[PDB]
Short mmCIF file of all heavy atoms in Angstrom, two decimals:
data_model
loop_
_atom_site.label_atom_id
_atom_site.label_comp_id
_atom_site.label_asym_id
_atom_site.label_seq_id
_atom_site.Cartn_x
_atom_site.Cartn_y
_atom_site.Cartn_z
N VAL Z 355 -3.61 -6.43 -17.27
CA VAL Z 355 -2.90 -6.38 -18.54
C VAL Z 355 -1.43 -6.66 -18.23
O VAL Z 355 -0.89 -6.06 -17.29
CB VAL Z 355 -3.04 -5.02 -19.21
CG1 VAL Z 355 -2.45 -5.03 -20.62
CG2 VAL Z 355 -4.49 -4.61 -19.27
N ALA Z 356 -0.73 -7.53 -18.96
CA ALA Z 356 0.63 -7.87 -18.51
C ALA Z 356 1.67 -6.75 -18.40
O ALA Z 356 2.66 -6.90 -17.68
CB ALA Z 356 1.19 -8.94 -19.43
N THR Z 357 1.45 -5.65 -19.10
CA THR Z 357 2.40 -4.54 -19.10
C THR Z 357 2.01 -3.30 -18.30
O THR Z 357 2.54 -2.22 -18.54
CB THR Z 357 2.72 -4.13 -20.54
OG1 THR Z 357 1.50 -3.81 -21.23
CG2 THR Z 357 3.43 -5.26 -21.27
N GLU Z 358 1.11 -3.45 -17.34
CA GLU Z 358 0.68 -2.31 -16.51
C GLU Z 358 0.58 -2.69 -15.04
O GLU Z 358 0.71 -3.86 -14.68
CB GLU Z 358 -0.65 -1.77 -17.01
CG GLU Z 358 -0.49 -0.73 -18.11
CD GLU Z 358 -1.60 -0.78 -19.16
OE1 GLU Z 358 -2.79 -0.57 -18.80
OE2 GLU Z 358 -1.27 -1.04 -20.35
N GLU Z 359 0.35 -1.70 -14.18
CA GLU Z 359 0.23 -1.98 -12.76
C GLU Z 359 -1.04 -2.75 -12.49
O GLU Z 359 -1.96 -2.78 -13.32
CB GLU Z 359 0.21 -0.70 -11.91
CG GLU Z 359 0.15 0.64 -12.67
CD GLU Z 359 -1.15 0.88 -13.43
OE1 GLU Z 359 -2.13 1.38 -12.81
OE2 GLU Z 359 -1.20 0.58 -14.65
N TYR Z 360 -1.08 -3.36 -11.32
CA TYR Z 360 -2.23 -4.11 -10.88
C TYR Z 360 -3.23 -3.09 -10.35
O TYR Z 360 -4.43 -3.17 -10.60
CB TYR Z 360 -1.84 -5.07 -9.75
CG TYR Z 360 -3.03 -5.77 -9.16
CD1 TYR Z 360 -3.64 -6.82 -9.84
CD2 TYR Z 360 -3.60 -5.33 -7.96
CE1 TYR Z 360 -4.78 -7.42 -9.35
CE2 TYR Z 360 -4.75 -5.93 -7.46
CZ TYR Z 360 -5.33 -6.97 -8.16
OH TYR Z 360 -6.48 -7.57 -7.69
N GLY Z 361 -2.71 -2.12 -9.61
CA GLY Z 361 -3.56 -1.11 -9.05
C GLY Z 361 -2.75 -0.14 -8.20
O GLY Z 361 -1.54 -0.03 -8.36
N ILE Z 362 -3.44 0.52 -7.28
CA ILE Z 362 -2.84 1.52 -6.42
C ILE Z 362 -3.22 1.36 -4.95
O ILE Z 362 -4.41 1.22 -4.63
CB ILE Z 362 -3.31 2.92 -6.85
CG1 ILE Z 362 -2.82 3.22 -8.26
CG2 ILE Z 362 -2.85 3.96 -5.86
CD1 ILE Z 362 -3.44 4.47 -8.84
N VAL Z 363 -2.22 1.39 -4.06
CA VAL Z 363 -2.46 1.29 -2.62
C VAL Z 363 -1.97 2.56 -1.91
O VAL Z 363 -1.14 3.30 -2.45
CB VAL Z 363 -1.71 0.09 -1.98
CG1 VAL Z 363 -2.39 -1.21 -2.35
CG2 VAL Z 363 -0.26 0.07 -2.43
N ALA Z 364 -2.49 2.83 -0.71
CA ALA Z 364 -2.06 4.00 0.05
C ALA Z 364 -0.59 3.81 0.44
O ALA Z 364 -0.08 2.69 0.47
CB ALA Z 364 -2.92 4.19 1.30
N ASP Z 365 0.09 4.90 0.76
CA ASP Z 365 1.49 4.80 1.10
C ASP Z 365 1.93 5.43 2.42
O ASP Z 365 2.99 5.10 2.94
CB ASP Z 365 2.32 5.40 -0.03
CG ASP Z 365 3.55 4.59 -0.30
OD1 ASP Z 365 3.40 3.37 -0.54
OD2 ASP Z 365 4.67 5.17 -0.28
N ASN Z 366 1.10 6.32 2.95
CA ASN Z 366 1.40 7.00 4.19
C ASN Z 366 0.10 7.28 4.91
O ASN Z 366 -0.98 6.93 4.43
CB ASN Z 366 2.08 8.33 3.90
CG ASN Z 366 1.15 9.33 3.22
OD1 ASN Z 366 0.51 9.01 2.21
ND2 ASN Z 366 1.05 10.53 3.77
N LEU Z 367 0.20 7.94 6.06
CA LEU Z 367 -0.97 8.28 6.85
C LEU Z 367 -1.31 9.76 6.71
O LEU Z 367 -0.83 10.58 7.49
CB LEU Z 367 -0.72 7.94 8.31
CG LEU Z 367 -0.70 6.45 8.62
CD1 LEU Z 367 -0.29 6.22 10.06
CD2 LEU Z 367 -2.09 5.88 8.35
N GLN Z 368 -2.12 10.09 5.72
CA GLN Z 368 -2.49 11.48 5.52
C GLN Z 368 -3.08 12.10 6.79
O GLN Z 368 -3.89 11.49 7.49
CB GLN Z 368 -3.49 11.63 4.35
CG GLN Z 368 -4.94 11.18 4.61
CD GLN Z 368 -5.73 12.14 5.50
OE1 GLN Z 368 -5.60 13.35 5.39
NE2 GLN Z 368 -6.57 11.59 6.37
N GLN Z 369 -2.62 13.31 7.10
CA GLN Z 369 -3.10 14.08 8.24
C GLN Z 369 -3.36 15.44 7.64
O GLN Z 369 -3.18 15.64 6.43
CB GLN Z 369 -2.05 14.21 9.33
CG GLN Z 369 -1.66 12.91 9.97
CD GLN Z 369 -0.61 13.13 11.04
OE1 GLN Z 369 0.35 13.88 10.83
NE2 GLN Z 369 -0.78 12.49 12.21
N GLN Z 370 -3.75 16.39 8.47
CA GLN Z 370 -4.04 17.72 7.94
C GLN Z 370 -2.81 18.44 7.36
O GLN Z 370 -2.90 19.22 6.40
CB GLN Z 370 -4.70 18.53 9.04
CG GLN Z 370 -3.78 18.90 10.16
CD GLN Z 370 -3.73 20.41 10.31
OE1 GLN Z 370 -4.77 21.06 10.54
NE2 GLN Z 370 -2.52 20.98 10.15
N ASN Z 371 -1.65 18.15 7.93
CA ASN Z 371 -0.38 18.73 7.52
C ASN Z 371 0.36 17.82 6.53
O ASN Z 371 1.42 18.17 6.03
CB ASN Z 371 0.49 18.91 8.74
CG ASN Z 371 0.54 17.65 9.59
OD1 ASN Z 371 -0.45 17.32 10.29
ND2 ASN Z 371 1.66 16.93 9.53
N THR Z 372 -0.19 16.62 6.30
CA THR Z 372 0.43 15.66 5.38
C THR Z 372 -0.50 15.28 4.24
O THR Z 372 -1.62 14.84 4.47
CB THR Z 372 0.80 14.37 6.11
OG1 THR Z 372 1.52 14.68 7.31
CG2 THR Z 372 1.66 13.49 5.19
N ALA Z 373 -0.03 15.45 3.02
CA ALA Z 373 -0.84 15.12 1.86
C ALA Z 373 -0.81 13.61 1.65
O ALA Z 373 0.24 12.97 1.83
CB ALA Z 373 -0.31 15.83 0.63
N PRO Z 374 -1.95 13.02 1.28
CA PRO Z 374 -2.00 11.58 1.06
C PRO Z 374 -1.14 11.18 -0.14
O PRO Z 374 -1.14 11.86 -1.17
CB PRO Z 374 -3.49 11.34 0.82
CG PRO Z 374 -3.93 12.58 0.14
CD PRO Z 374 -3.27 13.63 1.00
N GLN Z 375 -0.40 10.09 0.02
CA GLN Z 375 0.45 9.56 -1.04
C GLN Z 375 0.00 8.15 -1.41
O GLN Z 375 -0.65 7.46 -0.62
CB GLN Z 375 1.89 9.48 -0.59
CG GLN Z 375 2.53 10.80 -0.35
CD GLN Z 375 3.86 10.61 0.33
OE1 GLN Z 375 4.75 9.92 -0.20
NE2 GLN Z 375 4.01 11.20 1.52
N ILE Z 376 0.37 7.72 -2.62
CA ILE Z 376 -0.02 6.40 -3.08
C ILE Z 376 1.15 5.66 -3.70
O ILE Z 376 2.15 6.27 -4.08
CB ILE Z 376 -1.13 6.48 -4.13
CG1 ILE Z 376 -0.62 7.21 -5.37
CG2 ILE Z 376 -2.36 7.17 -3.54
CD1 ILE Z 376 -1.62 7.25 -6.50
N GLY Z 377 1.00 4.33 -3.79
CA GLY Z 377 2.03 3.49 -4.37
C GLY Z 377 1.49 2.63 -5.50
O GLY Z 377 0.33 2.21 -5.48
N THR Z 378 2.33 2.37 -6.49
CA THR Z 378 1.92 1.56 -7.61
C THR Z 378 2.30 0.10 -7.42
O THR Z 378 3.44 -0.21 -7.10
CB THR Z 378 2.54 2.08 -8.88
OG1 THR Z 378 1.79 3.21 -9.32
CG2 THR Z 378 2.57 1.01 -9.95
N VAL Z 379 1.33 -0.79 -7.62
CA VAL Z 379 1.56 -2.22 -7.44
C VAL Z 379 1.92 -2.92 -8.76
O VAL Z 379 1.07 -3.07 -9.63
CB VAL Z 379 0.30 -2.91 -6.85
CG1 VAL Z 379 0.67 -4.28 -6.30
CG2 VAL Z 379 -0.29 -2.03 -5.75
N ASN Z 380 3.17 -3.35 -8.89
CA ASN Z 380 3.59 -4.03 -10.11
C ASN Z 380 3.77 -5.52 -9.89
O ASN Z 380 4.11 -6.26 -10.81
CB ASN Z 380 4.89 -3.43 -10.64
CG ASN Z 380 4.72 -2.02 -11.15
OD1 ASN Z 380 3.79 -1.73 -11.92
ND2 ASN Z 380 5.62 -1.13 -10.75
N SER Z 381 3.53 -5.96 -8.66
CA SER Z 381 3.65 -7.37 -8.29
C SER Z 381 2.60 -7.66 -7.23
O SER Z 381 2.77 -7.29 -6.05
CB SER Z 381 5.04 -7.67 -7.74
OG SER Z 381 5.11 -9.00 -7.26
N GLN Z 382 1.52 -8.31 -7.65
CA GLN Z 382 0.42 -8.64 -6.75
C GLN Z 382 0.15 -10.13 -6.65
O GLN Z 382 -0.17 -10.78 -7.65
CB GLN Z 382 -0.85 -7.92 -7.22
CG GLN Z 382 -1.99 -8.03 -6.26
CD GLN Z 382 -1.59 -7.63 -4.86
OE1 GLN Z 382 -0.91 -8.37 -4.16
NE2 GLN Z 382 -2.00 -6.44 -4.45
N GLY Z 383 0.28 -10.68 -5.44
CA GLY Z 383 0.03 -12.10 -5.23
C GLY Z 383 -1.43 -12.38 -4.91
O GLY Z 383 -2.23 -11.45 -4.78
N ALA Z 384 -1.77 -13.66 -4.78
CA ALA Z 384 -3.13 -14.09 -4.47
C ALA Z 384 -3.82 -13.23 -3.42
O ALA Z 384 -3.26 -12.96 -2.36
CB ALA Z 384 -3.11 -15.53 -4.01
N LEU Z 385 -5.05 -12.83 -3.72
CA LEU Z 385 -5.82 -11.98 -2.82
C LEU Z 385 -7.27 -12.45 -2.71
O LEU Z 385 -7.95 -12.64 -3.71
CB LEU Z 385 -5.80 -10.55 -3.34
CG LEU Z 385 -5.16 -9.47 -2.47
CD1 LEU Z 385 -3.86 -9.95 -1.87
CD2 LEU Z 385 -4.93 -8.27 -3.35
N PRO Z 386 -7.76 -12.65 -1.48
CA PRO Z 386 -9.13 -13.10 -1.28
C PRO Z 386 -10.10 -12.35 -2.17
O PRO Z 386 -10.23 -11.14 -2.07
CB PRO Z 386 -9.37 -12.82 0.19
CG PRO Z 386 -8.04 -13.07 0.78
CD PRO Z 386 -7.10 -12.40 -0.19
N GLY Z 387 -10.78 -13.06 -3.06
CA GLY Z 387 -11.73 -12.40 -3.93
C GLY Z 387 -11.30 -12.36 -5.38
O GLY Z 387 -12.10 -12.03 -6.24
#
């Protein structure tokens, strides 16, 4: 949809002491598939 994110990607390396974080994709170029 032109006014929303493309999707969500991981942002860090979650470990037991680190909570997993994510990033919002507002600019996505050509992707296999």
Side-chain angles (χ1 to χ4, degrees):
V355 187
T357 56
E358 273 145 61
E359 7 67 85
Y360 174 76
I362 296 170
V363 286
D365 220 54
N366 67 308
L367 288 174
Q368 74 74 39
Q369 295 180 315
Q370 70 121 59
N371 48 287
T372 311
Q375 293 170 58
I376 64 176
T378 280
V379 196
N380 292 312
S381 174
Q382 188 51 285
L385 243 43

